Amino acid sequence: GNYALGPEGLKKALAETGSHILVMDLYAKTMIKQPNVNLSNIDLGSEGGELLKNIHLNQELSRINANYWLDTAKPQIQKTARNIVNYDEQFQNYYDTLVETVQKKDKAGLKEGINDLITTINTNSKEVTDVIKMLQDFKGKLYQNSTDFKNNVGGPDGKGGLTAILAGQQATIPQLQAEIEQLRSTQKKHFDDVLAWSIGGGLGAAILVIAAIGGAVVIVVTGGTATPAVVGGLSALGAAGIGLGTAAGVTASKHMDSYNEISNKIGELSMKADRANQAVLSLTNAKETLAYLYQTVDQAILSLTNIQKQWNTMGANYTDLLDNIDSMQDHKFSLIPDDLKAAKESWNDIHKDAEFISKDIAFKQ
């Protein structure tokens, strides 16, 4: 067209943002359900007793950070999506007036309408900057809690901390720690592969997958270790028209089943372990999740930075129209409705999916 008045790359950025919200919700809920590590009636010496006291303080702060995600940080990301919905409602409500001002050759009227939309675009861009600052602050708190916990569990380098005291008592502990770390990194890759398939299908498909997974998540606590699983995997998507039965859908289903397979295995390791080995499992599990949490907020910051870039690009595109209207000859002026109509359709197309991202994913209560 002559003027690009549509949502630009907002669809792709929303799909990524929705995927990060799901992952943060899972990790936060898992952290909240994991209890303080039980090493009662195990002689750890004074060194180990101090490390255990510090670990319990770290675990209490992990649960505070998880609740901050759920109650404070997430709603600010959801407002970013609500602002997309509200821009569509403003655009749809201005549309007939903007078309009328073209038909009446009313340049002042059209310019005032476009200026009002620019005002909203600029407000939306400024609001994302504030959300990114809030997330950067939160990332700093997640990184501090992660590194404090890692140091109390394993020292700076994995050669120390409470795990080395327990490994001094039981020679099988290092192999157990390594097994958990491997299972958790394999499992995260499987979940990332499911998310890759859901994003690859477009925002519409992404929202159906997010709803199906969120609605099916259960958190199981075994031997003091909390582990998520997705009941029935991707089963609920079989009639969703997103290609679950395609080769790529079958691969995504297999990854979800492998994710659940690893949750089962971690529970099995915990069931068979004594108290000390259960502590190695639970602390190692938590260590991995606390690092994944700050990594996922970093990803969320990147996706909101992209949303900010899209609002800024859109503000430039509308300002180009605004600046050109006064000198524009009648023929080009009469074509502006092509750009309005194209934008009407693209904005309406993003509304329901933005609305979804603006509201909690429905997990079990």
Numbering used by the authors: 42 to 406
Paper text:
The Hbl toxin is a three-component haemolytic complex produced by Bacillus cereus sensu lato strains and implicated as a cause of diarrhoea in B. cereus food poisoning. The toxin is composed of three components HblB, HblL1 and HblL2, all of which are essential for activity with no individual or pair wise activity. A crystal structure of the HblB component was published in 2008 and all components are predicted to share a similar fold, characteristic of the alpha pore-forming toxins (α‑PFTs), also related to the Nhe toxins of B. cereus (another 3-part toxin), the HlyE toxin from Escherichia coli and the App6 pesticidal protein from B. thuringiensis (known as Cry6 prior to a recent nomenclature revision). Although it has been reported that all components are able to bind to erythrocytes independently, more recent work strongly suggests that only the HblB component is able to bind and, thereby, to carry out a rate limiting priming step to allow lysis by the L components.
Here, we describe the expression of the recombinant HblL1 component and the elucidation of its structure to 1.36 Å. The electron density map showed continuous density for residues 41 to 404 (accession EEM59260.1) of the protein sequence. The overall fold comprises two almost parallel helical domains. Domain 1 is a bundle of five helices covering residues G41 to Q210 and R315 to K404. Domain 2 is a pair of two-helix bundles with an interleaving two strand β-sheet, covering the middle stretch of the sequence from residues A211 to D314. The points where the chain transitions between the two domains (residues 209–212 and 313–316) show some of the highest b factor scores in the structure and may represent hinge regions through which the two domains could move apart, although in the present structure they are in a closed conformation. Domain 2 in the head region also features the only beta hairpin in the structure, which is a typical feature of this class of protein, forming a hydrophobic beta tongue that has been shown in HlyE to undergo extensive structural rearrangement to contribute to the pore. In HblL1, however, this hydrophobic region is more extensive than in the other Hbl proteins, is rich in glycine and alanine residues and contains a central proline (Pro268) residue. No super structure or macro cluster of HblL1 is likely to exist in solution as a biological entity. In the computed complex, the beta tongue region of HblL1 is buried against the tail region of HblB; the β-tongue of HblB does not play a part in the dimer interaction.
